[PDB]
């Protein structure tokens, strides 16, 4: 295989020779240099947005991959210039990633219940790396996890303090923001190619009557998501 060794390692991690498995993902995968500005920004995002109540583990970045899923950017076009585009976290079990990279993030079918979907059947993201990392269900035995950075086209946000359990938004609303008590310091936000990166260290939001500790972002159209990076993380438990 002519692929870089980090990419070979990733392929083995989420699965028949290696190259056919790579072509099975239908995804261009490049290694972001560890000494690049991209990598510095992403490591800062990981460092600053770890919650205090997720003190069960520390996160260390092993490898950062730049991913382009076949056809995804072509279908994100309708939302490419939509205001309020943010770079957000999405965690998931390693076992799922083979699907995620080949089919993209997807929404539960209409026949599925709304139980367990705090803000309806959609695609969920976080601005706190620990909140997304919790959804990797990493164990002390296998302390390596995968997590996505995705450009989400949030547009006009429906800001909610309590759960709705429905996936239908009012007219002129493109996403839902679950308001948490703690948000990244907005004066530290930066723009990485027209896309906001809320990598500020956590502070209080002032939102009082909220059921969430940290923010959530939900979109209800797969075309509103554009995966940009895939991180491999060492979980260091206490
Ligand atoms: N992955 C992230 O980075 C991420 C980030 C921020 C908020 C997030 N919410 C989810 C989430 C939601 C819903 C589901 C989901 O299949 N429920 C349906 C199944 C179900 N029945 C339940 C009944 C009770 C309690 C929990 C339940 N989950 C999974 C993940 N993932 C989030
Ligand atoms: O009521 C939705 C509101 O937003 C728009 C933006 O074009 O549609 C977005 O929101 C819906 C989410 O439920 C989806 O129908 C659609 O895919 C999504 O882009 C408008 O259609 C509408 O005014």
Q: Which residue ranges have their beta carbon within 6 Å of ligand 2?
A: 168-174, 220-221
What would the DSSP string read from start to end of 44-72? HHHHHT--STTTTEEEEEEEEEEEEETTH
Q: Compute how many other C-beta atoms are within 10 angstroms of the C-beta atom of residue 53.
A: 10
Buried b (16+ CB within 10 A) or exposed e, 179-194: bbbbbbeeeeeeebee
Pocket test for ligand 1, best of 54, 93, 112, 116 (most atoms within 8 A of CB): 116
Distances (CA, A) of 215 to 136, 182, 203, 219: 18, 7, 12, 14
Number of domains in the chain: 1
Contact 202, 128 (CB under 8 A): yes
Q: Which two tokens stand for residue 79?
A: 């939302």
Alpha-carbon distance of 229 to 27, in angstroms, equals 12
Share in percent of the chain as helix, strand, coil (round to 5) = 25, 35, 40
Binding residues for NAD(+): 90-92, 99, 106, 132
Q: Which two tokens stand for residue 132?
A: 């997304």
Which CATH number goes with the domain that contains 1?
Answer: 3.90.228.10
Q: Is 127 in the pocket of ligand 1 (CB under 6 A)?
A: no
- What is the signed CA dihedral for 72, 76, 80, 85, rounded to 10 degrees? -90
Alpha-carbon distance of 80 to 28, in angstroms, equals 20
Contact 175, 219 (CB under 8 A): yes
Tokens 């190259």, located at residue = 19
Q: β-pairing, 190-191 with 180-184?
A: unpaired
Q: Which two tokens stand for residue 84?
A: 């309020």
Q: Where are the alpha helices (DSSP H) in the chain?
A: 5-13, 18-25, 37-48, 72-76, 94-103, 129-133
Q: Which two tokens stand for residue 226?
A: 């554009």
Q: Strand, coil or helix: what is 145?
A: strand
Q: Which helix (H) or strand (E) holds 26?
A: none
In sign, the C-alpha dihedral spanning 164, 121, 84, 128 is positive
Q: β-pairing, 175-178 with 157-160?
A: parallel
Q: Which helix (H) or strand (E) holds 190?
A: strand 190-191
- Picking from 161, 15, 20, 18, the residue whose alpha carbon sits closest to that of residue 96 is 15
Q: CB neighbours of 6 closer than 8 A, spacing ≥ 6?
A: 31, 63, 65, 232
Q: Compute how many other C-beta atoms are within 10 angstroms of the C-beta atom of residue 31.
A: 16
To what resolution in angstroms was this structure determined? 2.8
Q: Compute how many other C-beta atoms are within 10 angstroms of the C-beta atom of residue 67.
A: 18
DSSP 131: H
Q: How far apart, in Å, do the first and last CA atoms of the chain sit?
A: 38
Q: Compute how many other C-beta atoms are within 10 angstroms of the C-beta atom of residue 107.
A: 16
- Domain of 148? 1-238
């Amino acid at each position: 295989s002519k692929l870089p060794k980090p990419v070979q390692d990733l392929i083995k991690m989420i699965f028949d020779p290696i190259d056919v498995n790579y072509e099975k993902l239908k995804t261009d995968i490049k290694v972001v240099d560890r000494d690049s500005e991209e990598a510095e920004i992403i490591r800062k995002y990981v460092k600053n947005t770890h919650a205090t109540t997720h003190n069960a583990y520390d996160l260390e970045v092993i490898d950062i991959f730049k991913i382009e899923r076949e056809g995804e950017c072509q279908r994100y076009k309708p939302f490419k210039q939509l205001h309020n585009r943010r770079l957000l976290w999405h965690g998931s079990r390693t076992t799922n990633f083979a699907g995620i990279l080949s089919q993209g993030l997807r929404i539960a079918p209409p026949e599925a219940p709304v139980t367990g979907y705090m803000f309806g059947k959609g695609i969920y993201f976080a601005d706190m790396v620990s909140k997304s990392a919790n959804y990797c269900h990493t164990s002390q035995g296998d302390p390596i996890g995968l997590i996505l950075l995705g450009e989400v086209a949030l547009g006009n946000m429906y800001e909610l303090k309590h759960a709705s359990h429905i996936s239908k938004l009012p007219k002129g609303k493109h996403s839902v923001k679950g308001l948490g008590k703690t948000t990244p310091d907005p004066s530290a936000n930066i723009s990485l190619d027209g896309v906001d990166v809320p990598l500020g260290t956590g502070i209080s939001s002032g939102v009082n009557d909220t059921s969430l500790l940290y923010n959530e972002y939900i979109v209800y159209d797969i075309a509103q998501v554009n995966l940009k990076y895939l991180l491999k993380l060492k979980f260091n438990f206490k």
